[PDB]
């Protein structure tokens with residue numbers, strides 16, 4: 274099957290008219306719901322879209338039926354208090370609450386409450402999707418702890434769009450990330466330095482392990498940095514550019530994400546796995562094999578296979594480090610049953626062992 | 636499959652380049668629209684005609700230039716065919732209901748194209764002046780042209796033609812009676828319902844013996860053309876996820892790019908345009924209707940068959956409008972012989988020497 278994976282890729286490659294019309298309507302809903310948030314004298318007044326990539330590039334590495342957009346808000350200087358043992362989850366206080374700043378509305382004691390803030394955010398969003406009648410869009414019901422306000426756009430069929438509130442901090446990145454982003458031998462030290470001068474983001478995802486200061490915790494997000502890595506992924510500056518050579522890095526990612534996606538459809542036993550796991554694993558793969566020659570389109574089968582083997586080893590050692598927070602083990606026993614890891618390993622091996630019958634979709 | 640496949644490969648732009656130009660153009664358009672929709676304008680109710688999104692770049696045309704059409708539904712129309720051109724018309728109103736803004740641009744019974752295009756131009760110009768979000772400007776007006784051309788420059792320059800388009804829901808003009816000859820290709824039910832849709836009038840003035848006729852309009856079927864381009868096969872699944880690929884759009888994109896580059900080097904080629912190539916491939920898709928005659932493996936023979944057909948069009952000075960068969964885009968009166976022989980010789984040269992114009996690496 275040296276070219277069977279290309280057949281999968283080509284069948285996946287979607288209607289450029291499906292991309293445009295869907296990206297245009299998701300855009301319109303977002304760009305107007307954004308515009309209508311900045312003119313409402315709420316606390317989110319100064320909100321902006323964070324540049325994390327369009328629906329256009331999204332479909333090339335992920336499933337078209339599910340999208341996400343991040344609304345960033347810059348907040349006065351804040352101090353981060355590490356919430357327990359991940360280096361990813363935080364309680365947030367203001368170093369000093371500027372007078373008349375309406376974000377004080379959301380405090381729960383001294384800490385900025387992700388729940389209070391996300392609840393009003395949800396309220397304003399819900400309140401303007403209701404005036405939207407140019408498009409068929411509804412707000413799906415609340416799943417607790419989730420950072421998203423999920424829109425369901427069904428102009429013809431259904432596309433869920435997560436709207437994610439993001440606090441933006443221009444200060445130095447938190448110390449749990451200090452040896453994260455190990456791109457020095459791949460994208461290099463000047464790149465790493467300039468990415469770590471960018472802001473970082475906090476999304477209202479609560480951690481689930483405490484004495485009722487859980488509803489106030491936030492989680493670090495590096496979506497903007499991840500966009501950069503995904504689009505600037507070669508050691509050569511012209512990798513996958515018009516005047517440079519193609520690599521199969523992104524193709525391997527699309528294939529891995531499509532494989533997880535089809536497995537997750539058949540087996541609710543796979544509920545705990547998610548695209549971020551696969552994306553995290555390929556970041557490590559790209560660090561380990563940083564040479565563009567190690568990702569030759571002609572070697573797609575081998576490259577895909579070494580990503581599968583790497584992922585399988587993460588499952589078996591129950592270790593998959595967050596690429597930006599080496600402390601944070603996404604595959605720890607606290608988070609994913611060992612029986613679920615073993616289940617996914619079984620299914621992946623089976624597909625690996627038998628020429629990927631699940632891609633048998635002609 | 637020698638280099639055409641690779642020519643197409645490097646021609647493909649990446650979807651952030653697309654995303655960015657598309658969102659830029661669309662946001663300049665979207666709000667050029669959203670404000671014209673305001674009060675006091677004779678143009679309110681203007682909508683955007685779906686003639687296509689940025690995927691114009693997308694394997695059929697050049698990302699350099701783009702065009703959008705702003706459609707305006709008008710009351711019932713009387714069209715008086717200008718001379719017997721078939722494409723050019725005088726637009727009369729049966730009568731106007733009270734409160735219709737379009738009465739401003741009336742001359743007796745004649746909706747003046749020039750006078751309507753003029754303050755269309757005026758309001759657009761007065762509005763691109765009001766956004767500093769993007770660098771956008773309005774190039775000098777060209778006489779007879781139907782466009783107001785936006786010059787967009789975020790980083791690099793994209794010119795967007797905004798073309799006003801009257802929408803009429805009446806029957807298509809008699810000049811189109813034997814146009815759209817798709818019956819052996821997309822079929823008679825398709826032809827029927829396509830001709831049940833509205834048709835459009837853009838302010839392109841006709842060119843006669845004495846001078847530009849300031850108030851004539853020209854028929855446009857850009858909406859129908861977008862349908863055909865995207866629904867181009869005899870099999871309903873052609874180029875769909877559960878059907879087979881063809882190379883029709885690839886041939887169109889190769890041909891447009893050849894004309895583009897040839898025009899880039901020789902000023903003798905200023906008479907020829909994008910719509911000539913499109914019209915040629917429409918007839919070509921009519922002559923060779925079946926999807927097997929456009930298999931992607933036979934790309935080079937398909938391309939060469941289109942080049943041969945276009946050459947035959949050049950030498951014979953015959954390229955009928957696909958919708959208006961008595962309108963000859965390659966007539967004597969529109970393009971002189973010198974221009975056709977020039978183009979023909981360049982095309983034969985590139986064709987026999989394996990397209991040297993195409994060298995990139």
Ligand SMILES: Nc1nc2c(ncn2[C@@H]2O[C@H](COP(=O)(O)O[C@@H]3[C@H](O)[C@@H](COP(=O)(O)OP(=O)(O)OP(=O)(O)O)O[C@H]3n3cnc4c(=O)[nH]c(N)nc43)[C@@H](O)[C@H]2O)c(=O)[nH]1
Pocket residue numbers: 325341342343361418419420421435437476478492493494495496547548549550595
């Ligand atoms: N993106 C991200 N995710 C991180 C990070 N550190 C830890 N995580 C955790 O990994 C998964 C990611 O879930 P995904 O499905 O891949 O992405 C989610 C999801 O689509 C919605 C809702 O978030 P969720 O946490 O509620 O998702 P569930 O799968 O239902 O898991 P559960 O614990 O609640 O039950 O939003 C996406 N999403 C979450 N966070 C982000 C984000 O930061 N940026 C973007 N663009 N999308 C996000 C999750 O458990 C996540 O918490 C990390 O650094 N980045």
Ligand SMILES: Nc1nc2c(ncn2[C@@H]2O[C@H](COP(=O)(O)O[C@@H]3[C@H](O)[C@@H](COP(=O)(O)OP(=O)(O)OP(=O)(O)O)O[C@H]3n3cnc4c(=O)[nH]c(N)nc43)[C@@H](O)[C@H]2O)c(=O)[nH]1
Pocket residue numbers: 686702703704722779780781782796798837839853854855856857908909910911956
């Ligand atoms: N698209 C179209 N064009 C038609 C039709 N019937 C007759 N024509 C004539 O063919 C050319 C089209 O030239 P293009 O460059 O391919 O498209 C034009 C052009 O880019 C601008 C300005 O119009 P223009 O005619 O003034 O441009 P020039 O290249 O300088 O030609 P010239 O004769 O004046 O010297 O707008 C485009 N454009 C014109 N008309 C349309 C239209 O109806 N729809 C769309 N999307 N774009 C249009 C022209 O001479 C054209 O009039 C026909 O049915 N369709």
Ligand SMILES: [Mn+2]
Pocket residue numbers: 416418419420
């Ligand atoms: Mn959730």
Ligand SMILES: [Mn+2]
Pocket residue numbers: none
């Ligand atoms: Mn979820």
Ligand SMILES: [Mn+2]
Pocket residue numbers: 777779780781
């Ligand atoms: Mn012109």
Ligand SMILES: [Mn+2]
Pocket residue numbers: none
């Ligand atoms: Mn022109």
Ligand SMILES: [Zn+2]
Pocket residue numbers: 506507512513518519520521522
């Ligand atoms: Zn690459």
Ligand SMILES: [Zn+2]
Pocket residue numbers: 867868873874879880881882883
């Ligand atoms: Zn096709």
